[PDB]
Amino acid sequence: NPLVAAQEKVRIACEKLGCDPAVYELLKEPQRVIEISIPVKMDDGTVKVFKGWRSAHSSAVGPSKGGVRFHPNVNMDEVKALSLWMTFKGGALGLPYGGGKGGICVDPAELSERELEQLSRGWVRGLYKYLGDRIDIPAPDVNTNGQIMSWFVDEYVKLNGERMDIGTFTGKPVAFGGSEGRNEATGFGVAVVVRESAKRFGIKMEDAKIAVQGFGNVGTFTVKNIERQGGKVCAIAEWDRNEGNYALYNENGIDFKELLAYKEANKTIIVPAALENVITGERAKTINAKLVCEAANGPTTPEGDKVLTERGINLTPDILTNSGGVLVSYYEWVQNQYGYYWTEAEVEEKQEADMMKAIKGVFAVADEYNVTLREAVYMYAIKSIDVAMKLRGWY
Amino acid sequence: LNPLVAAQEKVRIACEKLGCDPAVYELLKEPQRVIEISIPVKMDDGTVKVFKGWRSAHSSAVGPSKGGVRFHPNVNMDEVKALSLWMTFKGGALGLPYGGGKGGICVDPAELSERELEQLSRGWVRGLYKYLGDRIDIPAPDVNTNGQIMSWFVDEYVKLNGERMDIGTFTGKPVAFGGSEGRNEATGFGVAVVVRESAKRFGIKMEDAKIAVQGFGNVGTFTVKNIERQGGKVCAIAEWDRNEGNYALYNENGIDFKELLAYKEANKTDIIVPAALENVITGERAKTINAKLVCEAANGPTTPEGDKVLTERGINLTPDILTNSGGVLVSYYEWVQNQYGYYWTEAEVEEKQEADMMKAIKGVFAVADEYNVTLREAVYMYAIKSIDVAMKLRGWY
Amino acid sequence: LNPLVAAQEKVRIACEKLGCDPAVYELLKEPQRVIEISIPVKMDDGTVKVFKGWRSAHSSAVGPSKGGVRFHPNVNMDEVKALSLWMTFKGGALGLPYGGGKGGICVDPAELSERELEQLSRGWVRGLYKYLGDRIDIPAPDVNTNGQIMSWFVDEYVKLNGERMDIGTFTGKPVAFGGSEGRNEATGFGVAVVVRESAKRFGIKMEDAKIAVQGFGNVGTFTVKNIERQGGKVCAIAEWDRNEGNYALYNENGIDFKELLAYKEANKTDIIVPAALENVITGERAKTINAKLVCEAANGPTTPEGDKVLTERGINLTPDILTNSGGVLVSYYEWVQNQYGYYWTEAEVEEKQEADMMKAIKGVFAVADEYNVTLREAVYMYAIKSIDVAMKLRGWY
Amino acid sequence: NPLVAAQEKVRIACEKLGCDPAVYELLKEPQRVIEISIPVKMDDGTVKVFKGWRSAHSSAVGPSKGGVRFHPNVNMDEVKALSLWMTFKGGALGLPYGGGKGGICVDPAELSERELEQLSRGWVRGLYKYLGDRIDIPAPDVNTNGQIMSWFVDEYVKLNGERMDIGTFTGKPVAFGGSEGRNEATGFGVAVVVRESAKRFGIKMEDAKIAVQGFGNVGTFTVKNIERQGGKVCAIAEWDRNEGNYALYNENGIDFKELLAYKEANKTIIVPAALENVITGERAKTINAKLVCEAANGPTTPEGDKVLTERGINLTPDILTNSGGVLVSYYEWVQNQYGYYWTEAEVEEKQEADMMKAIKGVFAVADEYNVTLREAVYMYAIKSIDVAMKLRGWY
Amino acid sequence: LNPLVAAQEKVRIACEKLGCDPAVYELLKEPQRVIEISIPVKMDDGTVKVFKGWRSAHSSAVGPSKGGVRFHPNVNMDEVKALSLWMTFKGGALGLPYGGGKGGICVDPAELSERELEQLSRGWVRGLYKYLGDRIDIPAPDVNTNGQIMSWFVDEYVKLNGERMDIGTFTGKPVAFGGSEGRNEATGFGVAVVVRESAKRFGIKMEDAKIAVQGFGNVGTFTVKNIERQGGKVCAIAEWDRNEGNYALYNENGIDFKELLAYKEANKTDIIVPAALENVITGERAKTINAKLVCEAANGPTTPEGDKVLTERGINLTPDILTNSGGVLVSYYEWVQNQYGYYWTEAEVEEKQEADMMKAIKGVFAVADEYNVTLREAVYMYAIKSIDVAMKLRGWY
């Protein structure tokens, strides 16, 4: 199922680009998918075998890269679809990668932490020959973190002739060859994307106030960097239990510094963070903004997008706006390659440079093929993936 | 219906009568590794069509993985998964130092040009080579593949393998290119051996009871041949045309194999050995039968309903998996010869082939005598039993 | 005292009577390579204990390194260094294409849980794998290790080896997992062969002179067996209990091996073959003895003081290293079978085993006849002589 | 013998940190030590076999790194101990390495220079499979230099499938992929460390005059950079033969420029360069300074340290103060990895940045665990090594 | 003149009478790969002289490449290219799973010290090792090289090969270092076998017709030996001195090999077998001859003018390439033994050697009978024919 959606993005993109039919044919599906049976000797002394996958969607432009999921919903079609999405996520930035992804159909909640390690090691032990800092680079996704990555790296090295190719997995702890600027990367990304969009649509940052929906990891750090960049946020929005779907508002902007401080202790234009499918056809018709900046994946439905265009509202698409995270993930890999590590300031400096480069591209394409930013970003990714496949002789 | 369940059920049933640990089934339930690839072909008209391909390593418990590659349009992930499980059985039955593997490409090779076919074959290797090798996983021919495809496989593989000619990474090669003697008539030789030892063990003397062979295909051709080669002879054949359905020649004293085969050139046309097709010997054919012994040469000819009456009617049965395993036995020999690069003669191959068939027979019988059950349920048990030991020793549970 | 000196002295003495170059001793003085590792184990209670482990490659002059792994609490670097030197001898004595190697872990495996024991074993491999391989260095069982540890060794090694099943990287495996037939009774078969050829060469006919075997352990059990298998027979045994010390049965005409072994089940209880322990045959036991020939089956039973009187008393002696080398001979065969992956039968293994023992015997005798000295000092010379040639050819001096 | 001393540093450190008992157990001893017999066909046509070692103490944090010794005193226990010291030396800086070291029990004085090469090549030929720019990286120590490193690299490459992983050995000549800033690195390090210490203890550099004991390689270049950094040295100190234990003093600072010039031609607060165990209990009680900056390894004895604390005298420990050398050694390896080479100015710029980062860390720890700089630096190293071992799953 | 043209012409002529595809010649026209290296030697006086060296892989169509290394001052790229082409023939003639390879160093080893010679040899390997290996390309001795150089080759190669002792990467090793029995007298044994089967096929009984051997070199020594070993005997020899030119002993009844060889120690001095030199049997020597059969043991003794009259005079001729191929046959066996690391006895080597020579003879004859032409033009056709099949299967055209 989930594959059609992403195939669609390609063939729509390819359709407006006018590229060769091979492009779609080659991009239609992953270059390689491995499915393995990972036995775990469970704590009670038992064996349960868990299914795992890694799907390399593309290596046209560079080595493959994307995260690993420990969900019970993951199956081959999930990973196939998700890795295709990755190829977009990457090319959008113009990174020298292609899409990859993996997962294990597990409920990690059911597992002991030695059991969980054994599974993680067992995953690598199943695929290592098709992984490496210049083949395919896994990273965290749902239910995985720097702890799993650290287990992945340990076992990988052992398998790898002891050569510490630590950039074979990103999303590592700084304590173990990860990178600064990680945790607040995406939020920093969004804030940069907001300013340049506004600037390009004739809006001055310090001069128009802003609404951010949701205050998770993204959100928290997008309001932060809006302040860091001379702007400020009047309307937030958030959810509880205990009310649900509520909204803060302390007038000439909510102080991020002091609001964040209250999440500790209390645990309690438009940027949607938080959840998907908020902003549907009949939600879009109700608001008042000249610009929408998607920070969450999803927000606007294909129906919503339609009215925005007619209502005269511009929209920067998730894939671009929230790509700072993977941008920083890429930096981590770079630092691993020559083994020199950057500072938070150095990471931000580059992060701003590169986001702006990617923005410039998506805009240039929209201006040229005369269409939406959402349909431009996907075209930007396909366009450069196309060049590489043709050069390499794949068609 | 999903082909895996049948394969899995054979495991479930075998493990159940063996009394082995529940992990055994859990570990054997599914392949250790399956790779699915997208193989692009630049077609002759200058076009790209991408074909899906698979290799499924079912098990390496006992040794490296081994099994054939299919170029059918019906092949999909479930096919290969199931098939490779069947291979694990096929192998263990003989007690070979392998595990089951299999691969395929969803293609209609008929639709392909022969440079297109090569590019596909090379493209298949180029997709998986890192999980292939004479000591990882060894592909061989299956439906729509032959020694020509293997030869393309080997060429591309060597290129990818740092130029080291590990030619035993693919079996079913031509003699002209590091294949082995005794190949073409291996299975037929196999079944004949098994026919004699079965009879002997069930109190039947070979030269002393006449025999029926259903089918005179490759298998049948060479099974009647070696029955003659081993002192016996075949009275009743059986075969199909177009132009008249199931017929059965019967020249009483037997009919020469030598003269009969000679007439298939030019003309193009006690106990029992079914060759040819499956699902002969249904419930109501197994009532009409008059024999003390059935020797399966084709895969199939067992309606599990048929098996039931045979047991009550007092008729013994040697199961395909064992009886027709000479082919893979010889495929194994090829791999051996590739490893130290010394090549055996047709006579040397047969000598070993007899030795080893007899070893495997003795094993299946010993098990049947011990766990007090059918040869068919014994052979599967024989395979699981030894796969089990290895998994335990290796620490898999 | 440092176990190396004894091993080294054997080199010093051999080189001295051979007249070989001083480099020979200098090069053989010590292992080419010793790795010492810290193996962490996450203990069952959730704890970490780190165990020291070693592998010592003494020599690869003649071929890859080979020797067993010890799980004793007494093992230390000097043990392994010395032991691996002894292996170089053990091997060359037979004229095998190996050099000496050995390893160990300073552990009391008794103190360990069996998942703990596995993690240790796997952890040992994980520490050294880059200097192991079927053509670098091949570990086997020694004290407190068996085919179970080898099977764990092999599993982890394969994982580390890019999934290539080079199973001949460890010998002493179960038949069920690529081990070899003839293993368990190899040494016993060995000594029996040597017993006959020695006698023959010293003018004694096998069926024609009765024999004494000290000890009926594994070794002794299978040495009396094959003495019977080879036309001879044993009158006097000898054994130990708890519950009465050194006793010796003597059923004159000989006593069946067949019936005797059968009584060890249920009951749990001319010339000479010492099995069992070392330092039997002291100076004052070698005065009381009445035999024309001694065949060492145990390592040890030579007080160098004892050897002295035997020579003057006119008593010949085949040294352990040669007489009991059938075990490693069969360990070698296993490795061979692993290389081309074809497995030999117990009969095929014995046939070769006899052939090769006789080849090695002939060599040791030829040397003794030439350099005009004892079999014990001849065997060590035999080993050094061929190791020497290789070092010279290879350009090591 | 020499091992207890270093084990002690760990268990004292671990004791005040409060880390898990596994930490000490795992750090107690090297992860791997190889002992080899290196035959040399001597010039007269003879064979002498020399013993050699490489001890990888730790790779927790990164690949192993440390030097090779050609002394007759080197034995397994030396190398074990020394590689443990390396793990400290490294982590002190927070470098992505762990400790390694090697040696050959030889008197290189007894050897011809073709003999010496044959030994050096023979050393690599003995261990190469456990060396590499991402396993274990050897460097010079006593009796070894860039000439030995160059022999190591030549043979290594040959063994390595011809792949020029030249960062497998550091301390190479600039002429062969070494790095600028090498020779005067440690001296540059010390000078930086002096200024920041003073600054943190309320002393202005140009404003208080300084004593440096010894004028070797260190010393020479520490007075140099003191001048380079606005300070200046009044009292030196040095040794001859021919007097021994003497001291210069040309008043408002000795001109480094002109003094150095006189070593050519003539061959003839507190920074001890030169030798060990100067500053014992009864030497410490005799001087007058608010700060001691160890440039030599050793100076202050456990007895001396005691009175300094009570007498109110602060002390920056060798391991930190003199670590610029290895800092630059690390840079060399970085440059080897992507094959771009830095300038002396670029090396110094980074060198100052990173020393200051490491200083900041050691101070932060001392301020937190409320103890001496000497006991803080060792704690700093263990602390980060600890995190990595736990992440990687080693306990 | 360029040595390649002669080699190439043999291909051109063979392909022409076979009727094979034009690609066959195009692909075989030249080596697949030639490496030329500059080997620096630090000379004893402390100096540097750089020697040129080559390895030329002509073909790997059928298997890995194999052929010897030359230390002559005449060796250049064209020599090695041509020579390796000749190797492809030499090999295929026997039907071995190899292709042709060859190497050399333009040196006068006479001018070299023996540590200098070693450094050169090691330096040669160090230059090419990545395109050598027991399954890529296997070097052996040729002019001015022996088992000593091979032993240096092997030592350096192992070092470069991650310490894996793939010793079958070089053949022509000493028995003392993984060489093979039967080596030294292989070719002589070869020619004797071929002598008998030729005679038999041309209606001549061995014990029943006396024989002439030109030359009593290594080849000749062991060809008269095995003629005796096979029931025949030699009347006329022939040999050269200094001190009198071409002479020929004739002790009628034959003259013992045993006693004759014994006199070469101390003294240092029907149908026909030329050993020794080439270009004996010119046009005007082939008119003066009285024999029904010529068996070439030396490479050469065929003025293509000579061949012409032999055919018309009615005299049959077995060509060098086939007759003297026992040497390389045994070189192959060595490689086999290295692969699984089990070593054969001189008797076992001869047994196989006879079997395989007879197989190759049978092939060359079958071809000659089919394409109705000379044995000399048949053997080359035999080699091309099987190389052809492989190239086609592998997809090379």
mmCIF file of C-alpha atoms in Angstrom, chain D residues 179-295:
data_model
loop_
_atom_site.group_PDB
_atom_site.id
_atom_site.type_symbol
_atom_site.label_atom_id
_atom_site.label_comp_id
_atom_site.label_asym_id
_atom_site.label_seq_id
_atom_site.Cartn_x
_atom_site.Cartn_y
_atom_site.Cartn_z
ATOM 1 C CA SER D 179 52.278 17.920 9.238
ATOM 2 C CA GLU D 180 53.409 21.459 9.917
ATOM 3 C CA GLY D 181 53.701 22.684 13.480
ATOM 4 C CA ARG D 182 55.101 19.352 14.674
ATOM 5 C CA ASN D 183 58.549 20.176 16.008
ATOM 6 C CA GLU D 184 57.416 23.094 18.197
ATOM 7 C CA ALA D 185 53.944 21.695 19.033
ATOM 8 C CA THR D 186 54.417 20.786 22.684
ATOM 9 C CA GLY D 187 56.195 24.072 23.462
ATOM 10 C CA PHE D 188 53.309 25.917 21.786
ATOM 11 C CA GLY D 189 50.968 23.775 23.913
ATOM 12 C CA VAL D 190 52.635 24.625 27.218
ATOM 13 C CA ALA D 191 52.672 28.358 26.459
ATOM 14 C CA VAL D 192 48.927 28.289 25.760
ATOM 15 C CA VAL D 193 48.338 26.292 28.935
ATOM 16 C CA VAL D 194 50.413 28.716 30.996
ATOM 17 C CA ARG D 195 48.398 31.762 29.857
ATOM 18 C CA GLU D 196 44.945 30.271 30.495
ATOM 19 C CA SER D 197 45.978 28.887 33.888
ATOM 20 C CA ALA D 198 47.366 32.247 34.961
ATOM 21 C CA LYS D 199 44.249 33.985 33.608
ATOM 22 C CA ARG D 200 42.017 31.618 35.568
ATOM 23 C CA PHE D 201 44.101 32.068 38.737
ATOM 24 C CA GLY D 202 44.053 35.869 38.418
ATOM 25 C CA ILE D 203 47.466 36.429 36.818
ATOM 26 C CA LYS D 204 48.023 38.609 33.731
ATOM 27 C CA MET D 205 50.648 37.275 31.319
ATOM 28 C CA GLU D 206 52.647 40.383 30.421
ATOM 29 C CA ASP D 207 52.411 41.263 34.115
ATOM 30 C CA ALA D 208 54.236 38.491 35.974
ATOM 31 C CA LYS D 209 57.626 37.058 35.149
ATOM 32 C CA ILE D 210 58.340 33.372 34.820
ATOM 33 C CA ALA D 211 60.897 30.598 35.434
ATOM 34 C CA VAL D 212 61.540 27.712 33.040
ATOM 35 C CA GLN D 213 63.682 24.744 34.177
ATOM 36 C CA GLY D 214 65.532 23.087 31.255
ATOM 37 C CA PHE D 215 66.021 24.186 27.633
ATOM 38 C CA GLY D 216 65.667 20.995 25.546
ATOM 39 C CA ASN D 217 63.109 20.714 22.778
ATOM 40 C CA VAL D 218 60.402 21.613 25.229
ATOM 41 C CA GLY D 219 61.719 24.673 27.047
ATOM 42 C CA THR D 220 63.313 26.088 23.936
ATOM 43 C CA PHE D 221 59.847 26.376 22.411
ATOM 44 C CA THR D 222 57.936 27.164 25.581
ATOM 45 C CA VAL D 223 59.981 30.333 26.220
ATOM 46 C CA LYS D 224 59.538 31.108 22.519
ATOM 47 C CA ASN D 225 55.762 31.065 22.652
ATOM 48 C CA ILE D 226 55.628 32.806 26.002
ATOM 49 C CA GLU D 227 57.206 35.729 24.125
ATOM 50 C CA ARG D 228 54.895 35.044 21.185
ATOM 51 C CA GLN D 229 52.034 35.415 23.640
ATOM 52 C CA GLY D 230 53.006 38.720 25.255
ATOM 53 C CA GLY D 231 54.745 37.268 28.307
ATOM 54 C CA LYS D 232 58.466 36.805 28.943
ATOM 55 C CA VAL D 233 60.919 34.623 30.905
ATOM 56 C CA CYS D 234 63.370 36.006 33.469
ATOM 57 C CA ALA D 235 64.909 32.840 35.004
ATOM 58 C CA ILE D 236 65.852 29.825 32.858
ATOM 59 C CA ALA D 237 68.021 26.941 34.303
ATOM 60 C CA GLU D 238 69.999 24.214 32.520
ATOM 61 C CA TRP D 239 72.758 21.555 32.885
ATOM 62 C CA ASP D 240 76.410 21.025 31.811
ATOM 63 C CA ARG D 241 79.541 18.982 32.622
ATOM 64 C CA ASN D 242 81.505 21.366 33.216
ATOM 65 C CA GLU D 243 79.431 22.741 36.115
ATOM 66 C CA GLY D 244 76.048 20.980 35.875
ATOM 67 C CA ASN D 245 72.775 22.321 37.317
ATOM 68 C CA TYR D 246 73.433 25.946 36.369
ATOM 69 C CA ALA D 247 71.067 28.854 35.588
ATOM 70 C CA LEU D 248 71.016 31.795 33.169
ATOM 71 C CA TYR D 249 69.346 35.150 33.998
ATOM 72 C CA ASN D 250 69.649 38.297 31.841
ATOM 73 C CA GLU D 251 67.176 40.326 33.916
ATOM 74 C CA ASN D 252 63.960 41.616 32.342
ATOM 75 C CA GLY D 253 63.690 38.334 30.479
ATOM 76 C CA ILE D 254 66.239 36.410 28.467
ATOM 77 C CA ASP D 255 65.961 37.102 24.755
ATOM 78 C CA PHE D 256 64.901 33.760 23.251
ATOM 79 C CA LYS D 257 65.835 34.875 19.727
ATOM 80 C CA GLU D 258 69.442 35.656 20.700
ATOM 81 C CA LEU D 259 69.853 32.911 23.317
ATOM 82 C CA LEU D 260 68.797 30.208 20.845
ATOM 83 C CA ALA D 261 71.326 31.721 18.427
ATOM 84 C CA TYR D 262 74.039 31.011 21.033
ATOM 85 C CA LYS D 263 73.142 27.314 21.405
ATOM 86 C CA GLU D 264 74.160 27.298 17.792
ATOM 87 C CA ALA D 265 77.924 27.968 17.901
ATOM 88 C CA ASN D 266 78.337 27.231 21.627
ATOM 89 C CA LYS D 267 76.173 24.091 22.228
ATOM 90 C CA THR D 268 75.681 25.672 25.671
ATOM 91 C CA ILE D 269 55.927 31.274 38.136
ATOM 92 C CA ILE D 270 57.558 27.870 37.386
ATOM 93 C CA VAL D 271 57.671 25.589 34.313
ATOM 94 C CA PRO D 272 59.768 22.484 34.803
ATOM 95 C CA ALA D 273 60.889 21.100 31.463
ATOM 96 C CA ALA D 274 63.913 18.718 31.417
ATOM 97 C CA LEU D 275 63.822 15.836 33.944
ATOM 98 C CA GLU D 276 61.649 13.915 36.396
ATOM 99 C CA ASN D 277 61.295 13.982 40.174
ATOM 100 C CA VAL D 278 62.708 17.504 40.458
ATOM 101 C CA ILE D 279 60.309 19.125 42.947
ATOM 102 C CA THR D 280 60.136 16.646 45.838
ATOM 103 C CA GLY D 281 58.650 17.274 49.309
ATOM 104 C CA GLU D 282 61.750 19.237 50.426
ATOM 105 C CA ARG D 283 62.248 21.037 47.073
ATOM 106 C CA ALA D 284 58.624 22.219 46.932
ATOM 107 C CA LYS D 285 58.994 23.803 50.400
ATOM 108 C CA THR D 286 61.872 26.003 49.147
ATOM 109 C CA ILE D 287 60.294 28.031 46.290
ATOM 110 C CA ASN D 288 57.991 30.987 45.829
ATOM 111 C CA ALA D 289 55.345 30.924 43.132
ATOM 112 C CA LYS D 290 51.544 30.910 42.891
ATOM 113 C CA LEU D 291 51.583 28.468 39.969
ATOM 114 C CA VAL D 292 53.425 25.435 38.591
ATOM 115 C CA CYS D 293 53.125 24.336 34.968
ATOM 116 C CA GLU D 294 54.542 20.882 34.311
ATOM 117 C CA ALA D 295 56.099 20.665 30.878
#
